[PDB]
């Protein structure tokens, strides 16, 4: 059962928790509060926590920037090895 | 972190696992293999395991039959107390 799926929690709690984490890339997927039906990827990086809105196309694939995936699961794993950001190199790693 | 979110697993493994469970209502949400981008709710009931396709409307709310929710989280909790089925009375309960 995935350890990164936190269901519907408030952005700030995600921040509060993640800020407590030790490694850059620790993340969780949460269900959006501001954007009902949208997922939000939260990841730790340095002093801050960043959030990426998970997009979904007309065919329903999800993606962050351009490469499409047919599941949060896939998208998550994929970025475990391909930066989630384009400025910095941030790789997802399971929270502790 | 929710114990019912299994990410993307094959329907049959869900069946295999759930069949092993002890109580009617033990369930998990899995990402659909046949319907990419769609979630599937699997629940145990008697000898069988049932699957409900999780619908999503144009506003993006999710639902199973008619009452809409803005998150799998909510939808899941709600049915912990309101049968997921209309013939039988099946309530979600966390897997073991
Ligand atoms: N997929 C992406 O997020 C890419 C591609 C599309 C747009 C933007 C890209 N993302 C980004 O540039 C970055 N993120 C963003 O632009 C994020 C994307 C996002 C938008 C809404 C969200 O709603 P929620 O918080 O209730 O769940 C969550 C995430 N935007 C963002 O944080 O805006 C500020 C913010 C502050 C307070 C409330 C909200 N909703 C949003 C990358 C990380 C640093 C900040 C910029
Ligand atoms: N939300 C629902 O599922 C309600 C409302 C809309 C349609 C049907 C309703 N569901 C149902 O009647 C019941 N379920 C159904 O009709 C389910 C709904 C569903 C459809 C596709 C799915 O794809 P996946 O397996 O790869 O994830 C998963 C679930 N249908 C179903 O099991 O069809 C048989 C089946 C067999 C083999 C492969 C597939 N995909 C489907 C309730 C439980 C007993 C069976 C009937």
Curated annotation (Swiss-Prot), chains A, B:
Coiled coil: none annotated. Changing residue 67 to P: Strong loss of clustering of phospho-LAT at the T-cell plasma membrane. Residues 4-96 form the SH2 domain. Changing residue 34 to N: No effect on the interaction with SOS1. It comes from the Eukaryota. Disulfide bonds: none annotated. It is found in: Nucleus; Cytoplasm; Endosome; Golgi apparatus. Ubiquitinated by RNF173, leading to proteasomal degradation and inhibition of the RAF/MEK/ERK pathway. In the nucleus, polyubiquitinated by RBBP6 at Lys-53 at DNA damage sites. The modification N6-acetyllysine is found at residue 53. There is a cross-link at residue 53 (Glycyl lysine isopeptide (Lys-Gly) (interchain with G-Cter in ubiquitin)). Homodimer. Associates (via SH2 domain) with activated EGF and PDGF receptors (tyrosine phosphorylated). Interacts with PDGFRA (tyrosine phosphorylated); the interaction may be indirect. Also associates to other cellular Tyr-phosphorylated proteins such as SIT1, IRS1, IRS2, IRS4, SHC and LNK; probably via the concerted action of both its SH2 and SH3 domains. It also seems to interact with RAS in the signaling pathway leading to DNA synthesis. Interacts with SOS1. Forms a complex with MUC1 and SOS1, through interaction of the SH3 domains with SOS1 and the SH2 domain with phosphorylated MUC1. (Microbial infection) Interacts (via SH3 domain) with hepatitis E virus/HEV ORF3 protein. Non-enzymatic adapter protein that plays a pivotal role in precisely regulated signaling cascades from cell surface receptors to cellular responses, including signaling transduction and gene expression. Thus, participates in many biological processes including regulation of innate and adaptive immunity, autophagy, DNA repair or necroptosis. Controls signaling complexes at the T-cell antigen receptor to facilitate the activation, differentiation, and function of T-cells. The SH3 domains mediate interaction with RALGPS1 and SHB. Belongs to the GRB2/sem-5/DRK family. This is Growth factor receptor-bound protein 2. The gene is GRB2.
